[PDB]
């Protein structure tokens, strides 16, 4: 009951959510992070119980949260200052999520990029069960991603995805897709029709986005 | 051992501690020096005291050898240790090569000390600038200045201190060959210089000369009023 | 010779203008009415026709419909809620839920749907109007101009070279450098050349008093952005709208971070803005959050550095073309004298060097007037200079 994905922000976290939304014929229900933040008091609270009220109504239904850290900031004692209403909405997310009068009718998918901000009362064991991480792609997945996004383009069979993914470390799916689009643009800059290897090689340089400063005096 | 770099490069290529030390020079009192063909003469301005106590201890003009005189500006404390090391060095030349020291040699010693002194670890650079005047062997009178970066630099005349660029404009706007005709005429040029930069021409002046074969001589405050008196007389008939 | 004769005959007809312009009726300066000779056609007809048959039709908000029957549920500003009905003059099609509708005061039934609320402080930052800065005036950074311009306008002016090639063009771009480098000035050329909605945003305007109040402004902004066909959103000084999440102990700067997270969610995740292109501009890019630095939001990362030599000489040709000068000067000496300088500083050298010609009595400035500009602006104002701790962007 209740899974949590986390990791670096480019590893693909929305992508599984829209994938599962394309898969199941359930009542999917999306949320935003600061969507449960209101100017008046208690309106986000009533908004939460309205959300789990309708999700309680549709019995085949899973609930999604994106960017949980907008509301799930760790509490703290302080005089003189400090927000409280966000902690109100977070506390009804706690109890209204799990605790008094539970159910097994809705399923929770939550997503963030950072973990240490979170109040551990929502990371307990039973509110959020399966805390899974998203690692950066090793090499073969980096070949696989640009292999995916290289589908709908005119590509001459010059390419070597093993060479490209091997000469490109430290990227994500967004940057590996960005290589595909910038190689998709430089061929139009030279007016070519298909894609060649050096187009990808220049797209690597643009995605790296280095500062140029007059450095040829090495070696 | 306080091993730390101080003088580091700016992102656009500057030395901030150096150019701040030149500002500390730029707030110092104004000193002017010229050279004659046979008698050199220089003098500091702005004695600025309470005019009711002692003063020989505040004299900002020293000698290094018989033939080398030296004045300065900036903060006072860092100057006299440079004076001490310069005296040790110029004595050590005579312990070596038998002649007296040439002014070009001793200024290369001072600037050479100051540059590596900026290059060292854990040291603010010196916050002084000096004018060094010497009539050498075979009687060729000349002078130099000393930047806080340590660039020795010859002149026919110069002026450093607070309010010195206008004084330099007066000196280029007034320096001829016949201005160095008579020695008292050159002194009248210097007193004409300080006077139109140090405002009130009272006892603030402190001039000292050298006749290229003597030691230094400081006039008592009688030729100050005498030369200033005939200066106001010549300007009075000129008006 | 007719000195008084043109005077009094001028004066009695200049007064006699007013002496019958009181007989016209232009007088009785109002408190908000109109002139008497205008609306004179709503005089007997629309006075009894736009008033006596015409209702008030108070506007409301729909909650929901229900099945098998119209039987709508209304909502109003302060009062209660009702079960209401259509008119015969409306189809049941465009009475979709969550909509404002015009409703009579007696039967309480629906007359016309309404456009939604816009919160017109968001409408204030629609630009409506264009500046005059030409890409001619942004000389020195031509490849930055090209690499920007191919992202900005080429899909908008030609949405066929990208389709027939089969690529989606990038949608996000930020601009960054030292201050005064031509970033804002470069954005003015884009607002000059384009044609779509250019909705500017200055990041400090989003700091609100209430909690989450700025996030609704973000939401309404992207809603009216989605209303248009193609739209350009401009951002400026986004360091204020967010650097990074760092929080510890007493929670500080949280309200900014919620707005920045809402900006993240409106940029990516669950149905892309589609035909909406964004454009950021900052001074220091180091503080910015890496999830905001992710491509798909900030695909292009155009650098603005100092011009090498020739960009500087070109900038002298820009800011110096329109002033009376000595003809036989050279600018290349001045660009030798300005290693590290901005186009703002070059412009200040030009606009100061003219003032040197205005000092004594001349009409055309000289090379030594330029030399009087260089040591002053560069070397006399060199104490502050604003650049070096921004070269490292700290
Ligand atoms: N390449 C250039 N050509 C002509 N003028 C320039 C150029 N670069 C800068 N300028 C001048 O510099 C001034 C500042 O421009 P702009 O406001 O874009 O600076 P900026 O790079 O946005 O830095 P800041 O954020 O501090 O304003 C402009 O008025 C412009 O006249
Ligand atoms: N196979 C893949 N693995 C990782 N990322 C991918 C893959 N395919 C596409 N992507 C990119 O990952 C992005 C998903 O972003 P995501 O990491 O969910 O952002 P955030 O986590 O900050 O919401 C998509 O925009 C897509 O371009
Ligand atoms: Mg995601
Ligand atoms: Mg700007």
- Which three-class secondary structure string do you get for chain C? CCHHHHHHHHHHHHHHHHHHHHHHCCCCCCCCCCCCCCCCCCCCCCCCCCCCCCCCCEECEEEECCCCCCCEEEECCCCCCCEECCCCCCCCCCCCCCCEEEECCCCCCEEEEECCCCCCCCHHHECCCCCCCCHHHHCCCHHHHHHHHHHHCHHHHCCCCCCCCCCCCCCCEEEECCCCCCHHHHHHHHHHHCCCEEEEEEHHHHCCCCCCHHHHHHHHHHHHHHHCCCEEEEEECCCCCCCCCCCCCCCCCHHHHHHHHHHHHHHCCCCCCCCEEEEEEECCCCCCCCCCCCCCCCCEEEECCCCCCHHHHHHHHHHCCCCCECCCCCCHHHHHHCCCCCHHHHHHHHHHHHHHHHHCCCCCECHHHHHHHHHHHHHHHHHCCCCHHHHCCC
Both tokens assigned to C162: 């990208």
Phi, psi of A167 (to 5 degrees): -85, 0
Q: How far is CA B212 from CA B31, B33, B143, in A?
A: 20, 15, 12
Quote the CA–CA distance of C156 and C194 in Å, as a whole number.
9
Return the residue matching tokens 């320096």: B175
Residue nearest to atom 25 of ligand 1 (CA): C179
Among candidate residues C103, C220, C232, C126, the one with its CA nearest the CA of residue C171: C232
- Check if A15 has its Cβ closer than 6 Å to any atom of ligand 2: yes
Do B179 and B167 touch, CB atoms closer than 8 A? no
Partnered with residue B134 across adjacent β-strands are: B68, B142
Say if the Cβ atoms of A9 and C245 lie within 8 Å. Answer: no
User: Taken in order C371, C377, C380, C385, is the CA torsion positive or negative?
Assistant: negative
Terminal alpha carbon distance of chain C: 77
Phi, psi of B218 (to 5 degrees): -105, 125
Among candidate residues C307, C304, C274, C270, the one with its CA nearest the CA of residue C140: C307
CA of B49, closest CA in chain C: separation in Å? 32
Quote the CA–CA distance of C35 and C41 in Å, as a whole number.
13
- Check if C315 has its Cβ closer than 6 Å to any atom of ligand 1: yes
**What residues 328-357 of chain C have any CB closer than 8 A to a CB of chain B?**
339-340
Quote the CA–CA distance of B73 and A173 in Å, as a whole number.
66
Return the residue matching tokens 């040829």: A216
Would you call A174 exposed, middle or buried from its count of C-beta atoms within 10 A (0-12, 13-18, 19+)? buried
The DSSP 8-state label assigned to residue B107 in this structure reads H
Do A100 and A53 touch, CB atoms closer than 8 A? no
Residue nearest to atom 15 of ligand 2 (CA): A12
- Which ligand places an atom closest to the C-alpha of C295? 2
The three-point CA angle C288-C289-C295 to 5° equals: 100
Host H or E run for residue A110? strand A106-111
Contacts of residue A11, Cβ cutoff 8 Å, sequence gap at least 6: A134, A135, A136, A137, A172, A173
Among candidate residues B162, B123, B169, the one with its CA nearest the CA of residue B22: B162
Quote the CA–CA distance of C340 and C225 in Å, as a whole number.
40
The DSSP 8-state label assigned to residue B21 in this structure reads H
- Check if A168 has its Cβ closer than 6 Å to any atom of ligand 2: no
Q: Is A178 at the interface with chain C, CB within 8 A?
A: yes
Phi, psi of C303 (to 5 degrees): -85, 145
Answer left, alpha or beta for residue C260, where phi above 0 means left and psi between -120 and 50 means alpha.
Answer: alpha
Q: Is C392 at the interface with chain B, CB within 8 A?
A: yes
Q: Which atom of ligand 2 is nearest to the CA of C296?
A: 25
Give the residue from chain A lying closest to C172, CA to CA: A178
Do C264 and C291 touch, CB atoms closer than 8 A? yes
Among candidate residues C118, C300, C323, C65, the one with its CA nearest the CA of residue C227: C118
- Strands, sheet with B61-63, edge to edge from the N-terminal-most edge strand: B61-63, B68-74, B128-135, B141-146, B152-155
User: Taken in order B89, B91, B96, B100, is the CA torsion positive or negative?
Assistant: positive
Q: Is C379 at the interface with chain B, CB within 8 A?
A: no
Say if the Cβ atoms of B12 and C340 lie within 8 Å. Answer: yes
Both tokens assigned to A133: 């991480």
- Strands, sheet with C197-202, edge to edge from the N-terminal-most edge strand: C197-202, C231-236, C276-282, C173-176, C300-303
Say if the Cβ atoms of A9 and C247 lie within 8 Å. Answer: no
Terminal alpha carbon distance of chain A: 58
The DSSP 8-state label assigned to residue A210 in this structure reads P
Among candidate residues C363, C362, C358, C388, the one with its CA nearest the CA of residue C373: C358
Q: Is C386 at the interface with chain B, CB within 8 A?
A: no
Within 8 A of C162 by CB-CB distance, chain A residues are 188
- Which ligand places an atom closest to the C-alpha of C294? 2
Binding-site entries of C for ATP? 177-184
Quote the CA–CA distance of C323 and C300 in Å, as a whole number.
37
SS3 B19: helix
Quote the CA–CA distance of A161 and A176 in Å, as a whole number.
11
Whether B and A touch (3+ CB pairs < 8 Å), yes or no: no
Partnered with residue C233 across adjacent β-strands are: C199, C278
Contacts of residue A159, Cβ cutoff 8 Å, sequence gap at least 6: A150, A195, A196, A197, A200
Q: Is B11 at the interface with chain C, CB within 8 A?
A: yes
Phi, psi of B40 (to 5 degrees): -90, 155
Both tokens assigned to B93: 């030349």
To the nearest 10°, report the CA torsion of B60, B65, B66, B71.
-20
User: Taken in order B90, B92, B97, B100, is the CA torsion positive or negative?
Assistant: positive
Q: How many CB atoms lie within 10 A of CB A61?
A: 18
Which of C258, C285, C300, C305 should we substitute to test contact with A (largest number of A Cβ atoms within 10 Å)? C258
Among candidate residues C189, C141, C143, C144, the one with its CA nearest the CA of residue C306: C141
List, in sequence order, every beta strand (DSSP E) within chain B.
Answer: 31-34, 40-44, 61-63, 68-74, 128-135, 141-146, 152-155, 157-160, 206-210, 217-218
Contacts of residue B226, Cβ cutoff 8 Å, sequence gap at least 6: none
Q: How far is CA C223 from CA B161, B196, B200, C89, C266, in A?
A: 66, 73, 75, 29, 10
Return the residue matching tokens 């890409």: C135
Return the residue matching tokens 């609100």: C208
Stated in angstroms to one decimal place, the resolution of this structure is 3.6
- Check if A153 has its Cβ closer than 6 Å to any atom of ligand 2: no
- Check if C131 has its Cβ closer than 6 Å to any atom of ligand 1: no
Do C57 and C109 touch, CB atoms closer than 8 A? no
Q: Is A5 at the interface with chain C, CB within 8 A?
A: no
Q: Which long-range contacts (CB under 8 A, 24 or more apart) does C333-338 make?
A: C333/C367, C334/C370, C334/C374, C335/C309, C336/C309, C337/C374, C337/C378, C338/C312, C338/C374, C338/C378
Do A152 and C166 touch, CB atoms closer than 8 A? yes
To test ligand 2's pocket by mutation, which of C294, C296, C297 has the most ligand atoms within 8 angstroms of CB? C296
Quote the CA–CA distance of C61 and C85 in Å, as a whole number.
13
The DSSP 8-state label assigned to residue B168 in this structure reads H
Query: C178: CA distance to ligand 1 center in Å?
Result: 10
Chains that touch C (3 or more CB pairs under 8 A): A, B
Q: How many CB atoms lie within 10 A of CB A4?
A: 22
Q: How many CB atoms lie within 10 A of CB C279?
A: 23
Among candidate residues C342, C347, C346, the one with its CA nearest the CA of residue C305: C342
Within 8 A of C339 by CB-CB distance, chain B residues are 12-13
Do B125 and B111 touch, CB atoms closer than 8 A? no
Quote the CA–CA distance of A142 and C284 in Å, as a whole number.
31
User: Taken in order C129, C135, C139, C145, is the CA torsion positive or negative?
Assistant: positive
Do A120 and A73 touch, CB atoms closer than 8 A? no
- Which ligand places an atom closest to the C-alpha of C302? 1
Q: Is A156 at the interface with chain C, CB within 8 A?
A: no
Say if the Cβ atoms of C254 and A73 lie within 8 Å. Answer: yes
Among candidate residues C174, C300, C304, C152, the one with its CA nearest the CA of residue A206: C300
Could you tell me where the DSSP H helices lie in A98-212? 140-149, 161-167, 173-189, 197-208
The DSSP 8-state label assigned to residue A136 in this structure reads P
Quote the CA–CA distance of A92 and A50 in Å, as a whole number.
12
Partnered with residue B63 across adjacent β-strands are: B69
- Check if C182 has its Cβ closer than 6 Å to any atom of ligand 1: yes
To test ligand 2's pocket by mutation, which of A115, A134, A174 has the most ligand atoms within 8 angstroms of CB? A174
Do B144 and B130 touch, CB atoms closer than 8 A? no
Quote the CA–CA distance of C335 and C314 in Å, as a whole number.
10
The DSSP 8-state label assigned to residue B9 in this structure reads B
Helices A173-189 & A197-208, crossing angle to 10 degrees?
A: 120
Query: B163: CA distance to ligand 4 center in Å?
Result: 38
Q: How was this structure determined?
A: cryo-EM
Quote the CA–CA distance of C241 and C292 in Å, as a whole number.
11
CA of C388, closest CA in chain B: separation in Å? 5
Q: Is B138 at the interface with chain C, CB within 8 A?
A: no
Among candidate residues A204, A185, A209, the one with its CA nearest the CA of residue A195: A185
């Amino acid at each position: 009951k209740g899974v949590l994905m986390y990791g670096p922000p480019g590893t693909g976290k929305t992508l599984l959510a829209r994938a599962c939304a394309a898969q199941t014929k359930a009542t999917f229900l999306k949320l935003a992070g600061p969507q449960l933040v209101q100017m008046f008091i208690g309106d986000g609270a009533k908004l939460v119980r309205d959300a789990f009220a309708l999700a309680k109504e549709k019995a085949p239904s899973i609930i999604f949260i994106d960017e949980l850290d907008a509301i799930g900031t760790k509490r703290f004692d302080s005089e003189k200052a400090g927000d409280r209403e966000v902690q109100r909405t977070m506390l009804e997310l706690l109890n209204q999520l799990d605790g008094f009068q539970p159910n097994t009718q809705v399923k929770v998918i939550a997503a963030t990029n950072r973990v240490d901000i979170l109040d551990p009362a929502l990371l307990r064991s039973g509110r959020l069960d399966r805390k899974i991480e998203f690692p950066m792609p090793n090499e073969e997945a980096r070949a696989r991603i640009m292999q995916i996004h290289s589908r709908k383009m005119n590509v001459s069979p010059d390419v070597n995805y093993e060479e490209l993914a091997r000469c490109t470390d430290d990227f994500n799916g967004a940057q590996c897709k960005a290589v595909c689009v910038e190689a998709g643009m430089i061929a139009l800059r030279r007016g070519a029709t298909e894609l060649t290897h050096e187009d990808y090689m220049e797209g690597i340089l643009e995605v790296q986005a280095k500062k140029k400063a007059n450095l040829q005096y090495y070696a | 051992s306080y091993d730390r770099a101080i003088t580091v490069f700016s992102p656009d290529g500057h030395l901030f501690q150096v150019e701040y030390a030149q500002e500390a020079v730029k707030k110092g009192s104004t000193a002017v020096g010229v050279r004659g063909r046979d008698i050199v003469v220089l003098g500091v301005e702005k004695k600025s005291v309470a005019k009711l106590q002692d003063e020989r201890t505040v004299r900002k003009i020293c000698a290094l050898d018989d033939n080398v005189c030296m004045a300065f500006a900036g903060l006072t404390a860092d100057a006299r240790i440079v004076i001490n090391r310069a005296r040790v060095e110029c004595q050590s030349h005579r312990l070596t090569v038998e002649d007296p020291v040439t002014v070009e040699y001793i200024t290369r010693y001072i600037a050479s000390l100051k540059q590596r002194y900026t290059q060292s670890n854990g040291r603010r650079p010196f916050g002084i600038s000096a004018l060094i005047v010497g009539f050498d062997f075979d009687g060729t009178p000349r002078l130099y200045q000393t930047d806080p970066s340590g660039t020795y630099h010859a002149w026919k005349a110069n002026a450093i201190g607070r309010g010195a660029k206008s004084v330099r404009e007066f000196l280029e706007k007034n320096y001829t060959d016949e201005a160095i005709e008579t020695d008292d005429l050159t002194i009248k040029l210097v007193i004409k210089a300080l006077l139109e930069v140090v405002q009130s021409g009272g006892k603030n002046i402190e001039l000292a000369v050298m006749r290229r074969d003597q030691s230094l001589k400081i006039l008592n405050p009688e030729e100050i009023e005498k030369y200033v008196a005939e200066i106001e007389k010549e300007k009075e008939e000129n008006e | 010779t007719y000195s008084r004769q043109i005077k009094q005959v001028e004066d009695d007809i200049q007064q006699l203008l007013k002496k019958i312009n009181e007989l016209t009726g232009i007088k009785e300066s109002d408190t908000g009415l109109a002139p008497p000779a205008l609306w004179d056609l709503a005089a007997d007809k629309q006075t009894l026709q736009s008033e006596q048959p015409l209702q008030v039709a108070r506007c409301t908000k729909i909650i929901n419909a229900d099945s098998e029957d119209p039987k709508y549920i209304i909502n109003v500003k302060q009062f209660a809620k009702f079960v209401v009905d259509l008119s015969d003059q409306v189809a049941p099609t465009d009475i979709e839920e969550g909509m404002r509708v015009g409703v009579d005061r007696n039967k309480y039934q629906i007359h016309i749907p309404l456009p939604p609320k816009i919160d017109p402080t968001v409408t204030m930052m629609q630009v409506e109007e264009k500046p005059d800065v030409t890409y001619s005036d942004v000389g020195g950074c031509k490849e930055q101009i090209e690499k920007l311009r191919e992202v900005v306008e080429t899909p908008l002016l030609h949405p066929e070279r990208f389709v027939n090639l089969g690529i989606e063009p990038p949608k996000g771009v930020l601009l960054f450098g030292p201050p005064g480098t031509g970033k804002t000035l470069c954005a003015r050329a884009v607002a000059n050349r384009t044609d779509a909605c250019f909705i500017r945003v200055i990041g400090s305007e989003l700091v609100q008093k209430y909690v989450g109040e700025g996030a609704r402004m973000v939401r309404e902004l992207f809603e009216m952005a989605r209303t248009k066909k193609a739209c350009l959103i401009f951002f400026d000084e986004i360091d204020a709208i967010g650097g990074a999440r760092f929080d510890d102990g007493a929670g500080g700067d949280n309200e900014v971070q919620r707005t920045m997270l809402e900006l993240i969610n409106q940029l990516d995740g669950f149905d892309p803005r589609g035909n909406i292109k964004v454009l950021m501009a900052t001074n220091r890019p180091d503080t910015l959050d890496p999830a905001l630095m992710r491509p798909g939001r900030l695909d292009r990362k155009i650098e603005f550095s100092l011009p090498d030599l020739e960009g500087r000489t070109h900038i002298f040709k820009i800011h110096a073309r329109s002033m009376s000068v000595e003809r036989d000067i050279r600018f290349e000496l001045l660009a030798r004298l300005c290693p590290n300088s901005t186009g703002a500083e070059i412009r200040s050298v030009c606009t100061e060097a003219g003032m040197f010609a205005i000092r004594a009595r001349r009409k055309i400035a000289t090379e030594k007037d330029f030399l009087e500009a260089v040591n002053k602006v560069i070397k006399s104002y060199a104490k502050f200079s604003a650049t070096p701790r921004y070269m490292t962007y700290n």
